[PDB]
């Protein structure tokens, strides 16, 4: 059973909008409030500005609390600002930002003053999703309530989404321009862009059926003896010292939810092993068979002869086998 999440790289475009209210006393200055908000970056700004020009506006316009709010960095006019790489941190993914210092209002004697700092931040984050893959979470602990595989093509629009359809924009034929090398990639990809209330996430879209794999290749057994006894099949491997018991009937692979991956991986590994070890002495006997073993193990088996819909739940304990 594939307990590992489906992992993929995403990019969070958002503007950190910090409004600080400062009170200036006679001999001191005190913060009377620091409103920090995260604004999504619009699609017209991710495609036209960030991806093409490598810049970002000095304003954030976003819907917060059922209001259209527009925040101007340093309270001055909107200007395009270059994205510079973030300060290096250990074990940290790449990130870029426009502004590096928090703007706070200039001193005036005995007056509360409000000062806005809009920092356009672009972070490459790891995003992960679990079955039924109707939601995925970014590395920043933010949940995104859309299937990773939501899109436009060939039934990839019936995938779950919890946002209005005006918040999603799959820019087909997307040319990624790295913000460090400033080099535009040649091979196009389908770019999904979801503008959540707090940020915008972009990820390269892939079809769901060949991208997920509800089973995971756990062991590749060169020599797995199969025997029939007591109306059941025993698959014994001396290499890993493990014996599984299955019903005599084959397991219909169509019954595995999201299961096109199992056949492909099994055939690839099986052909590789056959080429490596059994090409010169044995011959394959029929097409790969699939059996379900107690504990929830899916054994793909290729018999050899010498020339002479549901989810499978797998136990965490192999020591029974």
């Amino acid at each position, epitope marked *: 059973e594939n307990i590992a999440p489906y992992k993929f790289k995403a990019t969070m475009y958002y503007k950190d909008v910090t409004v600080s209210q400062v009170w200036f006393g006679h001999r001191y200055s005190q913060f009377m409030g620091i409103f920090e908000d995260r604004a999504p970056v619009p699609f017209e700004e991710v495609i036209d500005k960030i991806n093409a020009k490598g810049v970002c506006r000095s304003t954030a316009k976003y819907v917060r609390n059922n209001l259209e709010t527009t925040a101007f960095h340093r309270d001055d006019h909107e200007t395009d600002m270059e994205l510079k790489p973030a300060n290096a941190a250990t074990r940290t993914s790449r990130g870029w930002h426009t502004t590096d210092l928090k703007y706070n209002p200039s001193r005036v004697e005995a007056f509360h003053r409000y000062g806005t700092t809009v920092n356009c931040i672009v972070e490459e984050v790891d995003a992960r999703s679990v079955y039924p893959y109707d939601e995925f979470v970014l590395a920043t602990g933010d949940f995104v309530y859309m299937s990773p595989f939501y899109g436009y093509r060939e039934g990839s629009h019936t995938e779950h989404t919890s946002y209005a*359809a005006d918040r999603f924009k799959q820019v087909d034929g997307f040319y990624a321009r790295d913000l460090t090398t400033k080099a535009r990639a040649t091979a196009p990809t389908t770019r999904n862009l979801l503008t959540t209330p707090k940020f915008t996430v972009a990820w390269d879209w892939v079809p769901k059926r060949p991208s997920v794999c509800t089973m995971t290749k756990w062991q590749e057994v060169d020599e797995m003896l199969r025997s029939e006894y007591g109306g059941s099949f025993r698959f014994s491997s001396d290499a890993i010292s493990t014996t599984f018991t299955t019903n005599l009937t084959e397991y219909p692979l169509s019954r595995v939810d999201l299961g096109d991956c199992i056949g492909k991986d099994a055939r690839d590994a099986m052909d590789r092993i056959f080429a490596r070890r059994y090409n010169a002495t044995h011959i394959k006997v029929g097409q790969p068979q699939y059996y379900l073993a107690n504990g929830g193990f899916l054994i793909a088996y290729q018999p050899l002869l010498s020339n002479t819909v549901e989810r499978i739940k797998t136990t965490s304990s192999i020591e029974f086998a």
Partner: antibody, heavy 120, light 111 residues
Framework: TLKESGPALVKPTQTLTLTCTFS??????????VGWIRQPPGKALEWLAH???????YYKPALKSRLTISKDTSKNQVVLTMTNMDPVDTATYYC??????????????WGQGTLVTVSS | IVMTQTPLSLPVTPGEPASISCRSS???????????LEWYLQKPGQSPQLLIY???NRFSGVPDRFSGSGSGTDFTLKISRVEAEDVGVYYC?????????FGQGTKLEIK
């Protein structure tokens, strides 16, 4: 079925608005797309624009600054707008339906097309 | 992706096979792993109709005479037995990557 409709004569340097009426689909289903294509007389097919059910407009980059496709599902229509018309823009415009939502082939159902001449 | 259809005019006697080739500046292979190339046929005073989709698949309403092939940036429509009804202009259209475009088209003539 789709039916394109627009002024048959627009003078140069003006905006032309067209309209495509549908039948058998509304542009609010999960995967429906509607596209506009022109064809100058005697020339090959030139794609212009296409809009998905979620107001996701795609244009021709050459004509992107001039083309504006909008979708009004209340009247079940798509309006294609193209400003600063030039005599080169004289063409027959076709409204098509795209099954990329559902099938791997686009532009199955075309309208009869409307012929527009750009002249004063 | 730029589609150039060759030739621009293909006169073929009825009964003989015909081949039409059109190339794309870059690969039309999509991230899906499927190539979205469609062939269209515009007849005189008629709206175009799809003939071949996904390179090697024929749309319903199209006779077995038409057959598509090719890969990468080279694609070829092929009519095993050209008939009189095949008169018209043929277009190859890439749908994989935005923006989409048609080829320059080939006019089939019957000799």
């Amino acid at each position: 079925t789709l039916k394109e409709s627009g002024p048959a004569l627009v003078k140069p340097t003006q905006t032309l608005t067209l309209t495509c009426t549908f039948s058998g689909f509304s542009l609010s289903t999960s995967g429906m797309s509607v596209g506009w294509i022109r064809q100058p007389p005697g020339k090959a097919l030139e794609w212009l624009a296409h809009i998905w059910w979620n107001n996701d407009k795609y244009y021709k980059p050459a004509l992107k600054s001039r083309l504006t496709i909008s979708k009004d599902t209340s009247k079940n229509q798509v309006v294609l707008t193209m400003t600063n018309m030039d005599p080169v823009d004289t063409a027959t415009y076709y409204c098509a339906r795209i099954y990329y939502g559902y099938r791997p082939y686009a532009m199955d159902y075309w309208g009869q097309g409307t012929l527009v001449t750009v002249s004063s | 992706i730029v589609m150039t259809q060759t030739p621009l005019s293909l006169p073929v006697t009825p009964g003989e096979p015909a081949s039409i080739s059109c190339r794309s500046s870059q690969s039309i292979v999509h991230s899906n792993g499927n190539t979205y190339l469609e062939w269209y046929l515009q007849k005189p005073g008629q709206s175009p109709q799809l003939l071949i989709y996904k390179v090697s698949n024929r749309f319903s309403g199209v006779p077995d005479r038409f057959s598509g092939s090719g890969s990468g940036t080279d694609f070829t429509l092929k009519i095993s037995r050209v008939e009189a009804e095949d008169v018209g202009v043929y277009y190859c259209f890439q749908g994989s990557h935005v923006p989409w475009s048609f080829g320059q088209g080939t006019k089939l003539e019957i000799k």
